[PDB]
Design a protein around this nucleic acid. Structure first.
Ligand SMILES: [Mg+2]
Ligand SMILES: [Zn+2]
Ligand SMILES: [Zn+2]
Ligand SMILES: [Zn+2]
Lengths: 248, 48, 192, 67, 117, 144, 124, 259, 46
RNA sequence: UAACCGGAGAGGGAACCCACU
């Protein structure tokens, strides 16, 4: 264990082993139950780890390198599935990294964790700490094919927007943007923030015993001066009560 | 120990004498604005 | 105030029409890079059949890598000179760089003409694998593409190999920035 | 989770057009032609009738624990 | 957290009035009329009518800040002629013009439902 | 009680500031001594700091989520000395390389370059629109 | 509510704070009724070399006018800016994606052509 | 020194949108015409949402947002009603408001799509636009939970909110062949033609005019369906008259105070 | 005076007095919820 | 044959990790 490997095609001659019959069953999946493990059993593709990758020669493209032309080495043994598969979870949603700069790609891939959106499906039930959820999530207009493999079509983060590359007013000198008040009124990027609290009451050996109760000004002592009308009889705020800071 | 309590970066000599906590000091993100002169800064009402 | 209002009336943008060039200069770039590549293959074949005479003061390997670096630097400089000669004088890239606000004449060259050779630790990209920079190339080859020279532009897009090489360069720049900031902070504290 | 009622740029009414869009895609038209048949000329409305994702079917697939 | 309520854009409160006046000292016969809680949708057309007037030498309009609903107008007209009556004359000329647009637009729309054909 | 609310001369009032007051203003790390400048405070509705690009240029400030610190001196003599020493016109120019450090930001720089291009021919309405925003304007139109 | 001062992200790393907010009458507009949402920085673009962002915006306009989800796989090398400009000419718009904008304050056309189009943004 | 004689003609009329041309007027006046369409046209929109009991998974603030963004029919009762902020009455009165009700209990196994049709109105002249096609969806309700609410609609304009903005879209332009040369074309042949352009296919660029003004403004007004476009234009012009009259009276009193 | 609570998985209503085990009356389920307040709520549509 | 009383300071800390500059 501990070796890291990735699947790669097996090619013996100048021609590959991934045949039209196999892609026909793979296209007619979910009926024949033709699996990736069934493909591995067929031996078209195999797992290749680091030392073996060191000692083997690779064919970058069957349509371009394994095809007969001015030969480079003509001793191709393994072939990559797809070059974009060298990317990761955030680089997958990064569009046009072959056009972008590497510091920009690294920055965007880091910012993908800050990319705010509908994080889980059952967020109303799942009561977590510091949750964020947007009103109107949308899938991106232009993307790679890998996003719907990463389920980005179902739980995306953000809105396709009509931007204007220009310098209009001059309130956007350095890394600044101007926005539509009317659209933001209409629902543009309006999100909502969730914060959860907790409390564990304790029972001890009668020296100090904690019990959930509405405090009383004359009875209880050491109170901080605030309102308590929103507090119920037991000592719990009911749902649907508007409340601001410095309140019980 | 006290030797640690003073030789630390949070120690008395550095984290409490050379640099110490002060009030009367707000902190927030900024926003470009060219319509005011170079000598002026605009602040929020809650800060003020 | 008044320059912001004049800019408000005027308008200033950047676009693909500003970033694109013409086919005749594109063909000039392809001819230049093809000439440079066949020249460096000639030099490599010269070293293979050992007609290469080593320069005094360094080994044959150092002389060969100096020759390769000289050829690639000359080719990249000619490419940049050709592009900056043909920037068509309506490019907002040209206008803003002439204003001196941001960017550089070489940045037009990477975004338009060619990325060029990227260097790690002041040299070409070493043989991380068994005498090969990548398993995608054969063993014991010294091609500029296989060693870290980019034959394409940002507008043209990059192969994944040279994209990996640009990642090498960007990571090298970022680690330099981090250690630079930390060490200059400590040194400034020492001086104070 | 829901289709916005109005275009963020324009303000054209969108809410009925989502269910109409689903009806036409079940009637098996190409989605751009069905969008034009519904009559959304501007791309800033074509985007929201095109690339809207719905989550409320999953949310209602969850059981109502607050009854 | 500190959002301006929307009526701050248009509602004039107690203590301030719509128009204030100041006489300029840099050039004589120059007056500054400050309009409160209103914007370029009137500023532009008032300066259009002032440019239509040839009796003014200098005209000017500027908002002190976009988020501060206010505009100032500096007008320097020819001597023997007064900027105040110039400004009122320009406004009432614009009023008569837009009224004429209004009845012309009624007769045009009525022509449309009766049929241009 | 209003008996307590009654005032006489010589008392101390912890009062909210208005426009004109002097405040010091910085960004950690203070790499250069130009990185903390005095400024006059002013009030705007939306809740963030508002400032100039000519002050961002020495601040190494570029608005990608960078937040500034703002200290206000309490003592009047400290306020006066901050006003008269650390103020931006008083320290336009650095000593280390005897060069100006305020500069002109990129967008206005490119705009003024295209404005100072030779072939600029500006309409009367636009010149009319422009010459209010000169603070030091004499008030007379120049010859076209 | 999205106020000014929030942080907004492209899919290419251009961090941008919301400066100010103007009304719909105040933003510029095209010959048709489209009004934009974001005004990003044409000085930021050449420094960061976000030609990927430019191609992303142009492909987004093409895919929006076409009626299909665009594909932006990196190492495809089967589609390029020439084919995208061909699709733009097919759909009747300008070859290089620039258009004419109209001032919301004065009403005069902007002297320069202005780039416009959809993309994907995220607040942070 | 005095106003010119502008001209108005209309090409075609449709319920959703109208198209017309204006000539012999200033670009500033035309821009203000577009802005007075956008901003200050008063219509009726839902404003006060009281919620008795919500058990939908959508939250109450979201429900109020969509209710406010529902459009309504505001033919002439918007002109009859007075502003809520100015009308002296306890809370909202029927002279300055409209009452709405929405009670939905999804008791069926299928999801009951709450629609704009189900809003019960107090005045027949005001309904959702869709009624008098598919209705406007509000919230999809699962079986078991319900939503009970009361609402009041008032009169506002687009300086407040885009929900009180009734114009779906304005297309305002001029000079279809850049004869005034407001723009400079590096590649005018590559620049596509406008639909109002009359230049040749070989030229596609009108010659520069040394002496001229921008003229012949083309207008395409697309309503959201709440009002007829002609009524929208008349209301905008009437509000412009009222605002200029108020400015005249106030500044005349300012002059009287000065003298 | 006693609180009106909702079991959750039963979706049922029950009455709970203070200092009592938090269990459903027919199933004893520990996940347990409180009902909406009776105090009025309004929202302006902004 | 009885007369104006008023009450606001706070409570840990220490470590690790993440994020941002
Ligand atoms: Mg920074
Ligand atoms: Zn739209
Ligand atoms: Zn009333
Ligand atoms: Zn139970």
């Amino acid at each position: 264990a501990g070796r890291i490997c990735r699947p790669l095609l097996i090619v013996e001659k100048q021609k590959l082993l991934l045949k039209k019959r196999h892609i026909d069953q793979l296209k007619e999946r979910e009926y024949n139950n033709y699996s990736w493990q069934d493909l591995v059993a067929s031996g078209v593709v195999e797992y290749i780890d680091t030392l073996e990758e060191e000692t083997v020669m690779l064919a970058m493209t069957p349509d371009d390198l394994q095809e007969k032309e001015v030969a480079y080495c003509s001793t191709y043994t393994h072939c990559e599935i797809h070059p974009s598969m060298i990317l990761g979870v955030c680089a997958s949603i990064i569009p046009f990294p072959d056009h972008n700069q590497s510091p920009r790609n690294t920055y965007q891939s880091a910012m993908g964790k800050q990319a705010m959106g509908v994080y889980i499906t059952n967020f109303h039930v799942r009561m977590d700490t510091l949750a964020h959820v947007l009103y109107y999530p949308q899938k991106p207009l232009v993307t790679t094919r890998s996003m719907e493999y990463l389920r980005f079509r179902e739980l995306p983060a953000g809105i396709n927007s009509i931007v204007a590359i220009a310098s209009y007013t001059g309130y956007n000198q350095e890394d600044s943007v101007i926005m539509n008040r009317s659209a933001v009124d209409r629902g543009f990027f309006r999100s909502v923030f969730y914060r959860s609290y907790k409390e564990q009451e304790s029972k001890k050996g009668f020296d100090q015993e904690e019990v959930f109760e509405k405090p009383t000004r004359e009875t209880c002592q050491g109170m901080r001066h605030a309102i308590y009308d929103k507090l119920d009889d037991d000592g719990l705020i009911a749902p649907g009560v508007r409340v601001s800071g410095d309140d019980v | 120990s006290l030797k640690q309590r003073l030789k630390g970066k949070e120690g008395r000599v550095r984290g409490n004498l050379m640099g110490k906590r002060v009030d009367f000091s707000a902190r927030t993100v900024i926003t470009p604005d060219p319509n005011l002169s170079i000598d002026q800064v605009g602040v929020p009402r809650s800060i003020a | 105030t008044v320059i912001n209002n004049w800019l408000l009336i005027e308008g200033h943008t950047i676009g693909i029409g500003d970033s694109i060039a013409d086919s005749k200069t594109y063909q000039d770039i392809q001819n230049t890079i093809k000439k440079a590549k066949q020249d460096v293959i000639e030099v490599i074949e010269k070293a293979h059949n050992n007609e290469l005479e080593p320069t005094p003061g360094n080994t044959l390997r150092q002389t060969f890598e100096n020759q390769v670096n000289r050829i690639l630097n000359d080719a990249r400089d000619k490419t940049g000179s050709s592009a900056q000669k043909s920037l068509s004088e309506y490019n907002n890239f040209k206008s803003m760089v002439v204003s001196g606000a941001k960017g550089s004449k070489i940045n037009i060259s990477q975004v338009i003409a060619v990325v060029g050779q990227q260097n790690v630790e002041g040299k070409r990209i070493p043989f991380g694998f068994k005498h090969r920079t990548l398993p995608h190339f054969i063993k014991d080859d010294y091609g500029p593409e296989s060693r870290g020279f980019v034959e394409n532009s940002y507008l043209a897009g990059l192969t994944p190999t040279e994209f990996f090489f640009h990642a090498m360069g960007g990571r090298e720049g970022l680690i330099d920035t981090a250690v630079k900031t930390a060490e200059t902070g400590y040194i400034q504290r020492r001086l104070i | 989770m829901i289709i916005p009622v109005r275009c963020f740029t324009c303000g054209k009414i969108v809410g009925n057009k989502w269910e109409a869009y689903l009806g036409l895609l079940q009637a098996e038209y190409t989605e751009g032609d069905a969008l034009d048949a519904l009559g959304l000329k501007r791309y800033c409305c074509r985007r929201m009738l095109l690339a809207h994702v719905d989550l409320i079917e999953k949310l209602l697939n969850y059981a109502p624990l607050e009854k | 957290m500190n959002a301006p309520p929307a009526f701050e854009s248009f509602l004039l409160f107690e203590g301030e009035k719509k128009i204030t006046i100041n006489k300029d000292t840099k050039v004589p016969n120059a007056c500054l009329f400050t309009i409160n809680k209103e914007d370029h949708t009137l500023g532009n057309i008032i300066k259009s009518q002032l440019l239509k007037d040839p009796q003014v030498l200098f005209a000017g309009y500027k908002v002190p800040h976009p988020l501060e609903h206010k505009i100032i107008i500096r007008v320097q007209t020819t001597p023997d002629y007064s900027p105040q009556e110039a400004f009122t004359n320009a406004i009432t000329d614009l009023i008569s013009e837009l009224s004429l647009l209004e009845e012309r637009f009624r007769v045009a729309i009525k022509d449309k439902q009766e049929g241009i054909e | 009680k209003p008996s307590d609310l009654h005032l006489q001369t010589g008392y101390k009032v912890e009062r909210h500031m208005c426009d004109g007051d002097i405040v010091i203003f910085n960004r950690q790390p203070t790499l250069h001594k130009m990185s903390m400048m005095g400024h006059r405070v002013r009030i705007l509705p939306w809740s963030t700091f508002r400032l100039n690009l000519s002050v961002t240029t020495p601040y190494n400030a570029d608005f990608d989520g960078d937040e500034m610190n703002l200290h206000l001196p309490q003592s009047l003599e400290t306020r006066a000395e901050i006003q008269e020493l650390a103020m931006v016109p008083r320290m336009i120019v650095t000593p280390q390389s005897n060069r100006p450090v305020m500069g002109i930001v990129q967008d206005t720089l490119t705009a003024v370059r295209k404005f100072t291009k030779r072939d600029v021919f500006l309409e009367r309405g636009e010149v009319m629109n422009l010459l209010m925003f000169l603070s030091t304007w004499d008030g007379k139109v120049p010859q076209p | 509510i999205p106020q000014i001062g929030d942080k907004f992200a492209s899919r290419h790393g251009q961090k941008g704070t919301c400066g100010i907010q103007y009304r719909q009458e105040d933003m510029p507009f095209t010959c048709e009724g489209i009004t934009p949402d974001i005004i990003i920085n044409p000085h930021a673009i050449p420094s960061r070399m976000t030609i990927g962002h430019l191609i992303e915006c142009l492909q987004g306009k093409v895919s929006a006018n076409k009626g299909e989800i665009g594909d932006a796989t990196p190492f495809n090398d089967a589609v390029n800016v020439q084919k995208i400009s061909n699709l733009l000419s097919d759909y009747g718009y300008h070859l290089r994606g620039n258009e004419v904008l109209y001032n919301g304050f004065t009403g005069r056309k902007i002297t320069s052509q202005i780039f416009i189009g959809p993309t994907y943004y995220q607040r942070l | 020194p005095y106003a010119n004689q502008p001209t108005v003609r209309i090409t075609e009329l449709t319920d959703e949108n109208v198209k017309f041309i204006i000539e012999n007027t200033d670009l500033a006046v035309a821009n203000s015409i577009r802005r007075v369409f956008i901003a200050e046209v008063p219509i009726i929109a839902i404003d006060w949402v009281q919620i008795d009991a919500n058990s939908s998974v959508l939250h109450d603030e979201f429900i109020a947002h969509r209710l406010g963004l529902i459009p309504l029919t505001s033919d002439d009762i918007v002109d009859k009603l007075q502003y809520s902020r100015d009308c002296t009455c306890e809370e909202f009165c029927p002279e300055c408001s409209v009452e709405f009700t929405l009670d939905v209990r999804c008791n069926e196994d299928q999801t009951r799509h709450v629609t704009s049709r189900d809003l019960i109105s107090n005045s027949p002249r005001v309904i959702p636009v869709t009624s008098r096609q598919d209705d406007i969806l509000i919230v999809k309700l699962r079986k078991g939970q319900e939503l009970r609410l009361r609402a009041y609609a008032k009169k506002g304009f687009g300086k407040e909110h885009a929900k009180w903005n009734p114009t779906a879209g304005v297309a305002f332009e001029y000079d279809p062949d850049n004869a005034l040369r407001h723009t400079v074309y590096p590649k005018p042949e590559e620049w596509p033609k406008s639909e109002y352009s009359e230049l040749d296919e070989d030229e596609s660029q009108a010659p520069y005019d040394p002496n001229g003004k921008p003229e012949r403004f083309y207008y395409n007004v697309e309503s959201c369906g709440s009002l007829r476009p002609e009524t929208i234009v008349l209301s905008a012009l009437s509000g412009l008259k009222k605002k200029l009259s108020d400015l005249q009276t106030q500044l005349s009193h300012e002059i009287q105070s000065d003298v | 005076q006693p609180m009106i609570y909702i079991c959750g998985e039963c979706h049922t209503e029950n009455e709970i007095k203070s200092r009592d085990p938090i269990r459903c009356r027919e199933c004893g389920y520990r996940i347990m919820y409180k009902k909406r307040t009776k105090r009025l709520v309004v929202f302006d549509a902004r």
